[PDB]
Design a protein around this ligand. Structure first.
Ligand SMILES: [Mg+2]
Length: 465
């Protein structure tokens, strides 16, 4: 029932190494994405009889596993050759609708690109990635998806000793900006052009059959700008916005030291190793443009310097358009005024002063009735005078929309999540998981499928501090 093709292997030779996964000791499934497997046509047969393909212990017919090579700038510095060091592309699944999905197995063992590591993933990494990628998907933000998590008795040495794990990642492509950078700086511009032709052929098929490259790169800019805009509106900090972590398709790619904002803190740094705050939450719009600028440099051998700078200059416009329009929904501004950003900056500066909870503030603000000063937010601000002064002037704008309380409260409640993957919720699932209890991991996953539905439990509370 499952059909795999070898498109990367046969159409981009010398961009990978063929190899097989190396299993772990007594690997067992601890979670799988039943909804996603149904989307992909995977029989529940495959999730029973042992770890199977999800443990790197079997290959399905058509799979030809390989580890891709790439490079990239890490923290603004050319890090040289990187590549698939902790994962293996098992193959590319062809779906009945004609589309293709990568099956990338994190922690499948050593590769030529494993660098100083061991090629292994640990249980906490796999669970945090599965929780965050799924949370992002149900928030509507493009992302890789998690299909399965396998744990084992193989110990891996990091800060502690951790159980080796493996996660099956699904995405339409794992093309990164660093794929292009890798062959540019090796002075192989024809392999840069082959990557572009490959990417347009299979993922921008409507173009490329006369200015195909300008149109394509312009859309890559738009899709990255649109992605960063969505990160900002929900309060997601990636943590490692290196050029090898930037998806060419515009997906949230690689989940490591990420963090959804608990306290509103514009300069929040989620990566403990990000000493200079390069990937701080407020720096993400600027860092993405810099990453797009690295990518355009690799395309210069075959796309005019004129068109590249034009597509690069559209980044600010596409970002602010997407950001402004979504922030307007989060604020309930059913119409548009030149004004609306000043109210938002007011609210943002008060929140940063009080360290208010980002998600809860916007969720409570969605209970707003334009003609009443009453609000559950009055108890959440120490400076109640400041909030009351912002609220009636803010409600002053709402009354200019000429729209029902019922109509505005419905729109806001469909864009302001009641629920985000907070760090402590993941840690609680992790701790239970490490002791053999997966009921918390399954429960949190279930909640993150309905993030716009209000709850009575601690999944919507502020962290315990
Ligand atoms: Mg990475």
């Amino acid at each position: 029932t499952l059909s795999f093709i070898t498109r990367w292997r046969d159409e981009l030779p010398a961009t990978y190494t063929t190899l097989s996964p190396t299993p772990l000791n007594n690997a067992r499934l601890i979670w799988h994405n039943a909804e996603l497997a149904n989307t992909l046509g995977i029989p529940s047969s495959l999730f029973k009889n042992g770890a199977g393909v999800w443990g790197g212990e079997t290959l399905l017919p058509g799979m030809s596993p390989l580890a891709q090579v790439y490079s990239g700038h890490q923290f603004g510095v050319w890090a040289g050759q990187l590549g698939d060091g902790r994962g293996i592309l098992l193959g590319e699944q062809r779906l009945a609708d004609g589309t293709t999905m990568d099956w990338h197995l994190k922690g499948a063992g050593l590769t030529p690109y494993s660098r100083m590591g061991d090629g292994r993933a640990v249980l906490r990494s796999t669970i945090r990635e599965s929780l965050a990628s799924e949370a992002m998907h149900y928030l509507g933000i493009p992302t890789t998806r998690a299909l399965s998590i396998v744990t084992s008795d193989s110990p891996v040495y990091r800060e502690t000793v951790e159980p080796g794990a493996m996660l099956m990642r699904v995405a339409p492509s794992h093309l990164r900006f660093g794929h292009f950078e890798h062959f540019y700086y090796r002075r192989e511009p024809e392999k840069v052009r082959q990557l572009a032709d490959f990417a347009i052929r299979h993922y921008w098929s409507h173009l490329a059959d006369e200015d195909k490259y300008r149109l394509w790169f312009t859309d890559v800019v738009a899709r990255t700008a649109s992605l960063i805009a969505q990160w900002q509106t929900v309060g997601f900090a990636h943590g490692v916005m290196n050029t090898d972590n930037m998806s060419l398709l515009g997906l949230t790619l690689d989940y490591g030291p990420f963090g959804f904002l608990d306290d509103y803190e514009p300069g929040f740094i989620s990566n403990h190793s990000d000493h200079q705050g390069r990937y701080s939450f407020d720096n993400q719009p600027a860092v993405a443009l810099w990453n797009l600028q690295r990518l355009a440099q690799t395309l210069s051998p075959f796309v005019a310097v004129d068109a590249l700078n034009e597509a690069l200059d559209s980044y600010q416009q596409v970002l602010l358009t997407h950001y402004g329009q979504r922030m307007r929904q989060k604020l309930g501004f059913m119409t548009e005024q030149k004004e609306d950003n000043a109210l938002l900056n007011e609210l943002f500066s008060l929140m940063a002063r009080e360290r208010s909870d980002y998600t809860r503030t916007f969720r409570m603000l969605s209970l707003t009735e334009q003609h009443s000063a009453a609000s559950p937010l009055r108890d959440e601000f120490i400076d109640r005078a400041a909030f009351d002064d912002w609220f009636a002037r803010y409600r002053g704008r709402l009354q200019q929309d000429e729209v029902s309380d019922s109509e505005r409260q419905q729109l806001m409640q469909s864009v302001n999540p009641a629920l985000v993957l907070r760090n402590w919720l993941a840690q609680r699932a992790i701790e239970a998981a490490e002791k053999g209890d997966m009921t918390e991991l399954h429960r949190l996953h279930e909640a993150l499928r309905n993030p716009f539905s209000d709850r009575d439990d601690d999944y919507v509370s502020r962290p315990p501090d």
